[model samples]
Target chain A: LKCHNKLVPFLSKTCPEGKNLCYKMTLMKMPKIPIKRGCTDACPKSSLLVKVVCCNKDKCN
Target chain B: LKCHNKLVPFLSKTCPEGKNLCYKMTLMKMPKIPIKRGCTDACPKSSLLVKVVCCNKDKCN
Candidate 1:
C-alpha cells in the first residue's frame, strides 16, 4: 500500500511487500509527531487524544 | 478517570485509584472486541485498523 507519512507538503510512501492497508494517525499531545500516517496490517483501537484511520486501497491513508 | 468501554448499549466505568487518563479504542477485527475504552497513564502509537484516543479529564474517553 502507498500512504502519506509526512506533514505540510504531504508526501506519499510505498510500503514493503505484504502490507495491505494504510494507517493515518493524529496526535494531541505532540507537535513533532503530529499528523502521521503509514502502512500496516493489524489495526488497533483509538482513544480520546489519539486518532487513527486505516484504508485498504492504494494511497488510502 | 471515568470512561466508556461499551458499544450501542453504552456503559461508564471508573478507573482504579491513581488512574488519571482515559482512553478510547476502536477495533476492526472482532465484534467481541469492538470499540473499547478505559483508563491509562501512558499512551501508545496507533496503526491501521486500530484507533486510540486519550485525555486527562473525567469521562474524557
Candidate 2:
C-alpha cells in the first residue's frame, strides 16, 4: 500500500517547528516497542515513530 | 548514548541529490523483522529501517 506523507523518524519536542507538528510525529518506548495496525492517522507518543514523507504543506485533518 | 550524526530518515534513491548518499538509508522488512545490536556503521536492508536524523550532512565513515 502506498501513502502520501512524510515519516518524522524520531520523536523530538524541541525541534524547529517541531512542537507545531506535535500531533504528526509518533513517539514510543525504547526497545521491544509496541506495534500498531491499519493506516496511521496521527502520531502517538507510545508507538513507533514514522513520517509519511509527503509534499503537502499542512498535515492536519 | 547520544551520537552526533543524521539518519537518512527514509530509504530513497531518487531524491534531488540522488546516489550521492547510497551507502546510507537502511531498509528492512514490513513486520516481524529481526533486530540489530550496537551502533550501525552501515545500513542493512534486512533489519529495521532507521535514519539517525542527525544534524551532520555527510554520513559516510
Candidate 3:
C-alpha cells in the first residue's frame, strides 16, 4: 500500500507487503502535538494524548 | 469551555461547567469525512473511521 509522509522524509512511500497498514497519528493532549502519517506493519500504542489510526488502503492516512 | 462548530450551528458555543470539555472529532475513513468540534461534558466513543479528542480548556477544540 501507499502512504502519506509529509514529515521527515517529506515524500510519499510504498509499503512492503506485510507492512500493509498506513498509519496516521495525531496528538491532541492539550499542550498540542503534530499529526503524523506513514506506512507501518501495524499501529503503535497510543498515549493519553496521542492517537494512532491505521488504514490498509492507498492515501488512507 | 468554547468549541468550534462550523458544520451544524456554524457558530461557536460555550459549555456548561460539569461539561467543561471541548471535543474535536475527525474522520479519516478513506472516502474521507469532515472534522467536528464542540463542547461536551466528556469525550465520546470513537469509531474506526472517526477520532474523538477532548481538552478541558477554552478554545481547545
- Report the number of the highest-DockQ candidate: 1
- Per-residue CA lDDT of model 2 for B1-61, tens digit only, reads 2221223232222213222222322223332221211123223222133432212133221
Interface RMSD (one decimal) of model 3: 9.9
> Mind giving the per-residue lDDT tens digits that candidate 2 earns over A1-61?
2221233333222323222332322222333321211123223222123322212133331
Error in Å for residue A16 of model 1 = 1.0
Which pairs of residues have clashing backbones in candidate 3?
Answer: none
Interface RMSD, per-candidate values to 1 decimal: 6.4, 9.5, 9.9
- Candidates sorted by TM-score, descending order? 1, 3, 2
> Which of the two, 1 or 3, has more TM-score?
1
In angstroms, the error of model 3 at A4 is 0.3
- Number of the top-ranking candidate, with lDDT as the measure: 1
What global local distance difference test value does model 2 have?
A: 0.25
Per-residue lDDT of candidate 3, residues B1-61 (tens digit) = 6775433444777766666777766654532332556666646546444567788766766
Top candidate, metric TM-score: 1
Interface quality of candidate 2 as DockQ? 0.03
